[PDB]
Design a protein around this ligand. Sequence first.
Ligand code: DTP
Ligand code: DTP
Lengths: 95, 95, 95, 95, 130, 269, 139, 138
Amino acid sequence: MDEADRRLLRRCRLRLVEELQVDQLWDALLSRELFRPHMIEDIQRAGSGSRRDQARQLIIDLETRGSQALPLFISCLEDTGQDMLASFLRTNRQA
Amino acid sequence: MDEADRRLLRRCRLRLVEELQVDQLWDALLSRELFRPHMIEDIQRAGSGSRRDQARQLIIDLETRGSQALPLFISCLEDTGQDMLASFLRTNRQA
Amino acid sequence: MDEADRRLLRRCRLRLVEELQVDQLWDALLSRELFRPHMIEDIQRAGSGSRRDQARQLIIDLETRGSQALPLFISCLEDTGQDMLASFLRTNRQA
Amino acid sequence: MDEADRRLLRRCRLRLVEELQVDQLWDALLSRELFRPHMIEDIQRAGSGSRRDQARQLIIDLETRGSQALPLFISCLEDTGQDMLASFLRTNRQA
Amino acid sequence: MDAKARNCLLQHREALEKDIKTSYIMDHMISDGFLTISEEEKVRNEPTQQQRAAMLIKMILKKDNDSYVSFYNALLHEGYKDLAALLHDGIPVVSGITSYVRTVLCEGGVPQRPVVFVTRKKLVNAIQQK
Amino acid sequence: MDAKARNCLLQHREALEKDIKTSYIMDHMISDGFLTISEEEKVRNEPTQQQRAAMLIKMILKKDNDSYVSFYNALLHEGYKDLAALLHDGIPVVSGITSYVRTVLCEGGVPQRPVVFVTRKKLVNAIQQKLSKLKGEPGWVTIHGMAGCGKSVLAAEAVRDHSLLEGCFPGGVHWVSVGKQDKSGLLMKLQNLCTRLDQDESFSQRLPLNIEEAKDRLRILMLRKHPRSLLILDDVWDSWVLKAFDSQCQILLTTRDKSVTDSVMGPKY
Amino acid sequence: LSKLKGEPGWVTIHGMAGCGKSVLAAEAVRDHSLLEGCFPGGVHWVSVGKQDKSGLLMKLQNLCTRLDQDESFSQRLPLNIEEAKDRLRILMLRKHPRSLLILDDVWDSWVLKAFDSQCQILLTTRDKSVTDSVMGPKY
Amino acid sequence: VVPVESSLGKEKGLEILSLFVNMKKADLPEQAHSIIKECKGSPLVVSLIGALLRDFPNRWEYYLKQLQNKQFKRIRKSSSYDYEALDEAMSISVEMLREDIKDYYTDLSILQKDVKVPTKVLCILWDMETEEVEDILQ
Ligand SMILES: Nc1ncnc2c1ncn2[C@H]1C[C@H](O)[C@@H](COP(=O)(O)OP(=O)(O)OP(=O)(O)O)O1
Ligand SMILES: Nc1ncnc2c1ncn2[C@H]1C[C@H](O)[C@@H](COP(=O)(O)OP(=O)(O)OP(=O)(O)O)O1
């Protein structure tokens, strides 16, 4: 992941952890080979296991999953009906 | 544990941690006095606490539990319906 | 929170966790800005999630919420019909 | 609890968790002061809250409740009409 | 705490560590005013029941007579009959040259005073003042 | 501990170091009263399981018969069947000349009593009394006698009893042949002595060049390393020879003179 | 040699000049039963021969060097006979419990003095006197 | 600064000798009172007499006279203290002076014990201005 994408993920930290729905997201992430299944189990157990803690670990770990991790992640957002969040992200990448 | 058994456990590392079911295994291990109860609690908490992390610590710690730890461990596999895994192990010991 | 208020919360530990009704208390706590909403979700999930476990975490976390956390907390007790508990608390503060 | 009684509880793990009826057992346990009421609420919430999970936590926690916890526990079994289970236990203690 | 009490704790420490469920003891002790929240948080932070008990006892060994009693009472009150019995005989009563001297001053710091000396108080006091 | 036990540990040390998970052993040993918290902290400070085991064994090799048994029992109790089996034949008997006697007193502390000796009880008893007046402090006990009289030997059998040695001096016992000497020689005996005292090289390996620093390290060690342990001088001729050895320790010296207790402070007999 | 059961102790064989002797000792300690039971510490051997103070000192450093293979002590060379003797006793007691130390061809008394601390010795020689200066049981 | 320059009183002297010869005051010989008076408070000299009388339980007259004739050479002992006899200590303190002054000191021997002198007489002795003297004396 390039520095600009990483920086984007940090800038949107608050919004991501506040709004990301994870339970519905795992299938999408798998489909696009963003994470291996055990990686997902680890993220699921991050911290207290709340939605927020999972979300946070997801987006941190996301930075390590490749050059195209960010656009692929936006797509998974789209695929799971999180258009608003995906929209917030995209309009930054472009910005 | 002799060097050949230890070596076997290392060679089968990937398969063991991929396939070992642990939640059902503890009773068996106890019955054959392979581990003390606190040892089990420690293994349960290894790493992230996922099945894989528990499994890994189990098989590492197994190397320290005696001359007959490996055959006794195969038996516990058998006793808990993990015949496929036990079978993979045995056919190596013999091989 | 001053040491005297903290000490009061510890002295009344048993009574608080035995008698505190929490389900009805959250609105009050919010109204007086004693806790943020996520803080409340965390307290709700404390331990086993029983009334007692929630209550315990509430009163522990209460110690960190400000100089006036204790009197504000008594008021919320009053507001939710827990006069007996509020009364037990007040007669100590004064004592 | 002496080591022999503890060992007995471990040896009978499978049978206890398979057959123990708990809902009817709490009154008996209280009568003989084996557990405090909050301890019971905690055991009730153990794991998934199923009969088996409650049973398991009961018998684990039982090991900590005194020198006479095991015989007192057999009696409570008797008192609640779990003679078969109590019988399985006693014939071991003696054995 | 008194050496009797402390040695009683030390003697039975292993039994105590094996059985104590700290969540039923720390509450009483906090209520009684002889255990602090930060000590309790340090205890809570240990991952297993026996590790928590071990930490709590570590803390208690350093406390006063009242604290030992607080501990004992909570044990009794929470049905730990056998454990309290172990601690019963160790319950403490509640409510010049010494150890220090030969302890610190044997570091070479002082030659031993002679076999025979009269005591001159008047001057020693002055030196102590200055 | 007995040489049988210690050699059994040494023989099987590598097996023991490879397998022992110290957290399951140190607890028992602490409960039993044969391992200290500070030893346990020193063990805990090693980063790996085998390094911890190695440290623990290092410590145990220096301990007594009871300790070996404590160790063995904990091993057995914690399911280390094979390891206990290795240590079984090396178990020492636990609980006049006895085990203690040849255990502690083979440290060079005593020359063996001759092939043929009559027993003089009357004097030995006296020495035991005077020496027992201490209860511990710094202190001095002197026996001077006729030239050529039975003396040195007599002292050597003074510290023979089990009851005395165990109770009053469970720090160990040391012995130093001094004899007629000069400054150089005396200095030598000093380096040799301080070298003898620390077997774990807890201090650096270096040789102090003045009498003073020698004296210093002596005091530091004796106080810290070997608490309540009797240091015996043999055949002490001159005062300034005695000056050096003096720091805050218990001494039983044999000689021909009563004067040389001259320059030392503290109680005398 | 079996009278010992272990203690410090001394066993001497002296004989006619040129008689079969050294070899005879070398086959004394050949048996399995004896070696295993009575001496499971190991067995050591030292050629002494006619020597002076310097040489003797040398044999000492070499010996103590030979004893510890794990360098459990520091690497340094003791410069007096005394400290040599010391480290010998410490090692033999601690490191090698119940193990027989054999001397070969021992000529003089003061040569023997040094090697003496609290250990078992089987020495071969031509003389019966040099067991002179050592304390303890003799044969 | 705390001056210790003072010296002991009768009582303490008596107790020291007491503990040395193992008695109670009434059991002491009469000469005990006299000898201490000549001892003049220095814990040293007391420690000496109390050391020697330990060995030779009756020399009492011998020391009572020998301490009178004022010669301290006759008294010798070894102990924790660094020097044998009183004379030595003084002898050490004297030597550390400068080569210049060492003569000026000797002159001062003319004084009688207990005779306070004004400054002027010394000016007369060394033949120089007041303050100039007063400094050396200081
Ligand atoms: N209990 C004893 N029984 C038989 N002989 C004894 C006994 N004690 C001493 N001797 C005899 C034999 C010993 O070889 C010899 C040693 O005496 P010893 O006490 O060593 O003199 P010493 O060495 O103490 O005086 P010094 O040190 O001045 O030479 O004396
Ligand atoms: N069992 C033996 N069989 C045949 N020849 C022997 C035997 N023992 C000794 N010899 C003969 C051959 C050997 O080369 C020679 C060695 O004898 P040996 O015992 O070494 O004398 P020695 O070395 O002990 O006396 P010393 O030490 O005084 O020279 O003697």
